[PDB]
Design a protein around this ligand. Sequence first.
Ligand SMILES: Nc1ncnc2c1ncn2[C@@H]1O[C@H](COP(=O)(O)OP(=O)(O)S)[C@@H](O)[C@H]1O
Ligand SMILES: Nc1ncnc2c1ncn2[C@@H]1O[C@H](COP(=O)(O)OP(=O)(O)S)[C@@H](O)[C@H]1O
Lengths: 650, 650
Amino acid sequence: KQALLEVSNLVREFPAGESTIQILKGIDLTIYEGELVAIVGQSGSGKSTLMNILGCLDRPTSGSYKVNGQETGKLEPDQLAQLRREYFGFIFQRYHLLGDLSAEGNVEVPAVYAGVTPADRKQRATALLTELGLGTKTQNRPSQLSGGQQQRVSIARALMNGGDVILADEPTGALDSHSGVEVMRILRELNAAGHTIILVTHDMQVAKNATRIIEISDGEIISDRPNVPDQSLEEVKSDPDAAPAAWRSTLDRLSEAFQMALLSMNAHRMRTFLTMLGIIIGIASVVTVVALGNGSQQQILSNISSLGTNTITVFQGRGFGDNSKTANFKTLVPADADALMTQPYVSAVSPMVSTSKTMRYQQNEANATINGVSNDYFDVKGLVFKDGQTFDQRSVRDRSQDVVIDTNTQKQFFSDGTNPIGQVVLLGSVPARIIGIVEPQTSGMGSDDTLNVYMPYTTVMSRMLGQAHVRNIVVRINDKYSTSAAENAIVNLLTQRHGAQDIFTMNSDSIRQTIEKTTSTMTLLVSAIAVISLVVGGIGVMNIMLVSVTERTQEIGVRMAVGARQSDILQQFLIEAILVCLIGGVLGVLLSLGLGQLINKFAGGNFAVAYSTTSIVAAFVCSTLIGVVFGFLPAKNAAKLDPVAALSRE
Amino acid sequence: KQALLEVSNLVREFPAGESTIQILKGIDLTIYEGELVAIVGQSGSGKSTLMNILGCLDRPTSGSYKVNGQETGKLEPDQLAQLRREYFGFIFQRYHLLGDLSAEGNVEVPAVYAGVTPADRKQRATALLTELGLGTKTQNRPSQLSGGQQQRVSIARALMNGGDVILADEPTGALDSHSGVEVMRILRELNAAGHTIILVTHDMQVAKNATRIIEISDGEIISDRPNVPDQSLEEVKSDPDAAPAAWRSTLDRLSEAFQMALLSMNAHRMRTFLTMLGIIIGIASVVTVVALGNGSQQQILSNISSLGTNTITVFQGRGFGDNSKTANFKTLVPADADALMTQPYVSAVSPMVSTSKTMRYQQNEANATINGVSNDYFDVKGLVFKDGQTFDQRSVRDRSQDVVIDTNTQKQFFSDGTNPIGQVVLLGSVPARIIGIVEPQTSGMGSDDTLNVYMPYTTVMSRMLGQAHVRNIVVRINDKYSTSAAENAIVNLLTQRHGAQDIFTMNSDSIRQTIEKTTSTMTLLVSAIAVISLVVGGIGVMNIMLVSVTERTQEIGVRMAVGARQSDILQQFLIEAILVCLIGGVLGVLLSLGLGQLINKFAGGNFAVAYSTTSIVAAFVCSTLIGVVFGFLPAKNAAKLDPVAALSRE
Ligand SMILES: Nc1ncnc2c1ncn2[C@@H]1O[C@H](COP(=O)(O)OP(=O)(O)S)[C@@H](O)[C@H]1O
Ligand SMILES: Nc1ncnc2c1ncn2[C@@H]1O[C@H](COP(=O)(O)OP(=O)(O)S)[C@@H](O)[C@H]1O
């Protein structure tokens, strides 16, 4: 049969000066289930090292330590953690509780790592705290408890996963006489109930509370004797404490890891706020710059949209003056448009003049732009008729006073729902009857807001301007033919048709393309400058997480001792970083949205802010990725701590 | 006569639940110089509270406490610190040493806070450490010392500033039996030497080391009896330890505050690196963006300086399509420049043609752009002659083969130091004699880097091109007399000479002004976005400083008890932040300079990086201001800590 704790020729060496020093020197030691063992020696004796090895927090480097038959010498971290969850509970001189949790929570932690039903572990935690006289202090934080009360909490914690072997490191060293007596009473009562208890001390008067006293000095055991305490006659057991013992639970520990990181945020609200603030400012500047560049691009493009697709505009305008010295040189005339119409690369053509008059209806007045155009103009610019129809070529010839109106003029003058078609409006001093309504090119509520009116160019030229010439001529190029080659043909045709190079062009597609390219490139560079800010925010996240790993070093050690896997610690800290970056990426998005409405109020007619939902999604994802990347390094550093050095980190 | 410590009616209340609780209930107590006093009681007794008041770390809050006649009831923090420096030394259960310093440094700290000569305090530190058996461990850090060794370090520390009244709070509570014997031996020997010692404990067997035992319970003193230790027979005194003891010095404490901040940076090197890194990225991005916008503006403007000042260039339309359409439609001819010459607003005028030929010298060849210009061209464009002169008007008439060169061609062909003037070079197939060298308009190279040659336009048109027309004509407007009106007048005149409006103009000053304003505006917007990054860096600095205040809370408390003023603490932390941000600004500047040299390797001849020295200085100042500001709140929070709560922070 196996003895519960079986040590054989245990040698623990440490390197010291291109050589070694033995701290444990060939220790043989058998401890049976139910013994009350005290191991006593002074500083330097090796009692600590021995207990660390006994608690599966360290490995021999020479010898054998079998826990219920299981050799620990060659076990890997999660296997030793398995043994700690299975057979050991720990009590520390300084009563290492987790300041952020309640007594109940600290008691639960080992059951969290062992994968114990949360309802059942709640029951067990409050039951053990009540059994040890802390039934009314269940919800107190460690900062709300006295030393003895905290040590009683950690006794209940040690009992959570069974309490098979309670390893107690000088429990009565920090706290006073009375509460030391109480702690020792509890331990002896647990031993009476069958709990194996190993007490490590330097005060023989503490060791005398045990039934077996092993004395250690300079790495070797020098005494091993039974003992009967004197105070067993006073402390009669009038309060009979007898309380001995691929995809499933990973989810439970992930839920708890989220909860734990969340509580660490609630504990340090200023720190959390500042770190999130850095991420909020970063994400907000990136989403803002991107939406500003996109919306401004769309706005500038709509301001071009008064031109068509495959549209070549033929301008010639310049300085003003007399009829004989300026008008005689205005060679662009509608006969030129008639000539262009017959070219194999021209699918549509329209002269274009314009004037601005006061438009009247029953009582309304409003200034409006009256465009003198061809019946084909709507075909050139791609305008869509809402209700009516265009001009007849005859009505252009006959100087008709028919008129086409856009959506904006309908809103201005026919807000009642009165059908504009057939209604006579008055343009300055010229009456005109509406024969059609056009849906504009504009994309946006307040991106255009102008009143466009369309009459035959012959009528506007004759009745309103008194001129024989055209402001410009728009041409839509056939067959998707090379608009540039058609452009050159137009320049040669009109130039040969005129007496000289009296014209210049505007290629709508070329200008649009240049605007898209230039605005896109500038958007990319500037939003990269914003991403620099976001990078600095991420660096801040990493630095804070690393520092909180240092802060929580002892918490990490305690969690390991109670049963945490390196995985579990990694998940805990990494989830903290991720949650911090997400909560703040969302707030950066919302801040950017509010700032977007601010700009959309106070901006001009070129600056506009438009938020693509995939830039919002990209913001959320890149915030989470900053959490995963920048937070990872600290979370791994926490997961890889030596629980011995962590427990004694001070 | 006055007793050293004179206590009367100490009542210490703390609020607890819409009421208060008395922790000291009217304590009277007289302690004379040289007494060895133990104050003993269990948790709740008030012994610590009493000892804190005795040490000038708290105020009676009701009653009187006189230290050598000085009432503490109404004293302000720095006055209580004065009393601590004057009369008190402190020893703590956990032997609160400063992990970053050596034993010697920890011993020095109280002398730093007092007005003590650094050399003399070094001597005292090593002397006291040698007296207490730490002569060979003088340089060890606290992590390199045992509990007893650290406790002897803090004994020497308490003795540094005199050791008048040594308050020891459970000194033998953390450490083992043997080293407790040694600590108590040392304390008794100091008492024999005359030191007043007040020992506070809960273990009567420790209290029995004193000669006077005052027992306290539930806030009141219940026993006060003399005592003779049992070990007075053991200690025959064979080793007689008898060692009893704003413009001027503010600068010395500033030196020490700088040194302490520096050592704290060395202690946490990764933290320092990351915190500094944020500022480095911020300052580098801002200085980089500013230098990029400024230099690019200078480059793009240099490409315009070739258009001269107040110069209106008369360009002409394509005019091509055929060789016969070139002959037909190239209406801009040098006679038009002759006509422009006579106008009242034209001070100088030049036709301009250009072609590219291979420029040859003795054996050297390089392709060069030959500009056919008027003798006035240099006045219009504002070019300055380095050595020679321009053409004669006669030589323009006579189709002269004179040539003027720029500095780039001088470098290409006359690198020897050979004077180009009088030398005959060959341009394609036309020889030409150099009559002058011209210094260009440009500052940065960018795209030019071009070989410019100037010959009479009549000669280039006649001999090299075989054409009757001019590419464009430049005019310099006198007095700046309505250059915009001159543009229109030129168009009207040239249009009147031709058969149409077949010419257009370009106002050099308008273009320059537009470029200057637009690029300047882009510089401000983008560099503001970089400053966003710098802001996030500062926020990170603040968060880190708050965290290091929390981390060092006990260090702050120990410093206060040892004798630090709130001033001293604030200076310490403020200097830390300032120093980190200052260095991060310097490194941000150096990174920015390197990045500028990197950018200058890019293929964009429009992007250029120019560093103003006032943006470097601005970087230094704004980095230091981030240090002071963010930067400040943590340092004040450190200075305003309650030294009692700070010392008991865990
Ligand atoms: N890294 C390391 N390096 C060198 N020596 C070590 C190390 N770790 C432990 N030891 C030794 O084990 C003992 C630890 O606890 P003990 O209870 O025996 O005395 P303490 O004062 O440390 S509580 C101590 O006496 C040390 O001499
Ligand atoms: N903020 C505060 N609030 C309420 N009560 C306080 C407070 N501070 C001290 N006290 C009391 O004074 C005593 C402190 O030291 P003592 O040596 O007498 O016992 P300890 O267990 O704290 S070492 C302690 O027993 C407490 O009951």
